[PDB]
Amino acid sequence: GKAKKKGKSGAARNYMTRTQAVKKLQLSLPDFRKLCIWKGIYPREPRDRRKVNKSATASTTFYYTKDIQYLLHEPLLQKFREQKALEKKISRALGRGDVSNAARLERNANLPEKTGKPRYTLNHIIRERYPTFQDALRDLDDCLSMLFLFANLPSTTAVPAKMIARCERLCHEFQHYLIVTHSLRKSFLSIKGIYYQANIQGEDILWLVPYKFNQRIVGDVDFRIMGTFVEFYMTLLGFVNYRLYTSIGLKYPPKFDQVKDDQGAELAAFSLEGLDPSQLFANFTFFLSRETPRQPLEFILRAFGCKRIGWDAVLGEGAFTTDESDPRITHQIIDRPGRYPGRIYVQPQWVWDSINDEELKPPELYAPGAQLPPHLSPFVKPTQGQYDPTKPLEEQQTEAEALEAELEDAQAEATLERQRELEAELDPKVKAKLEAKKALERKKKQEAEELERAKGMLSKKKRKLFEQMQYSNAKKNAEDAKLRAKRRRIEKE
């Protein structure tokens, strides 16, 4: 029977704000952000914000109290404090002017700039974050997109170039596992870049690879948050690469030559020790020009099981015969704004389309200097009303637009009283089509009248929800009708 205060119990204990969490954990905000990113802590939203904090806003972020306590028990805090103290000692030595002591303290400080590695050990962090290997495989899309992006991207103060090179080694080892196990199934080319979907141990993973060009760094971007995510994903990718190579039986890591990497063989530079998609392009030798992207074509052909692939020596090394005069080249992929009868000149778009469809499309449509068929995304699952470009417009079309198109193709009591007064004083098919259109109009009017009666019988909040659903469906049907109409225009052209 003890009296209780209001703000003490319930959601107030269940949630705490980010300010209170930082003050409880005795941390700076960058350290708190790094810990949250590595541990997987995310804000969440309370049922009633006023119950938790009396002066609360839609802007403020609440956290789970057990998440904050678990961060408190995390042992990376002692490493953070030790590194802060060691940095203070290094600055003290540099100010006092002895460089030998500063270097001796730096070698304990274990800098990511000199190591090319994450500064802390995240192995146990990976262990609680992904308890099982299938969960680890499910969470790989963001990892692969991140590490391919930072393989492409320039280095900065937060992201060392040695660490970028280690990202490149890890992703190349992952690519060699993919082409060894043939684990890729889907490949897509888009204005975004190259989307790759691989099914590794029954889990579909799709990631984006940007095109080889100078990536724009305009605007405000924080590479420190990027660096934290990169360090986590490098640790995860290294461990999953080791497990995949151990499952395949190959030795990890694959030894890559520094001279070969300096030459630029990359996938050819990394060599792996022994200790229908394969049938597609199983026995064919393909040459690549300068304009063609050599490492995506080499990746997709090795994933499809191409035995030999060659390209220009300026593009890379560790390939087949770079000379086009060599008769061994069965096919050639070139996109230029010669004329060997043995060599079949075909498009990279044909390569993407063939690896998507497993059909080996004819090179006549994809001849150079000729317009190629439009490329299609394999990831799209068709649905009712979402519209399908592959589906015929005759197969899918609303009745009003169908009768309007039919009338356009054909073109390409009061009346009885007037007839009585007048007497006292192809085209039939078009008229029948107009009568069918009028019957459709009257049917739509009847349906609208029934809809209005039901809307009137609805209650107020149910009426508002019903109108919102009708508005959303009307927007979707409007976009679908616009797509169908301009597809009809393309068909007429």
Partner: protein, 82 residues
């Protein structure tokens, strides 16, 4: 190739624009046969008739500050700076 892909800027009409697309390099050169960033990197790597034009078109790279002549030690310096 890493320097070209990382810090690549074009000097056109007294301006400093990045080499985001190969179409910009194609419009800049046009008649010399250089229409791609890969082609420009190849012409930089292997000396050709348009080497001087390619060097004039390519802006001087502004490397980040690291924290006699070298025969082969310049690669480590370039990796540390970029």
């Amino acid at each position: 190739r890493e320097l070209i892909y990382k810090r690549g800027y074009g000097k056109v009409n007294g301006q400093r624009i990045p080499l985001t697309d190969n179409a910009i390099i194609e419009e800049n050169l046009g008649k010399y046969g250089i229409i791609c960033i890969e082609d420009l990197i190849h012409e930089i790597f292997t000396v050709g008739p348009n080497f001087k034009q390619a060097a004039n078109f390519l802006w001087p790279f502004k490397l980040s500050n690291p924290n006699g002549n070298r025969e082969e030690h310049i690669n480590a310096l370039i990796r540390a700076m970029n």
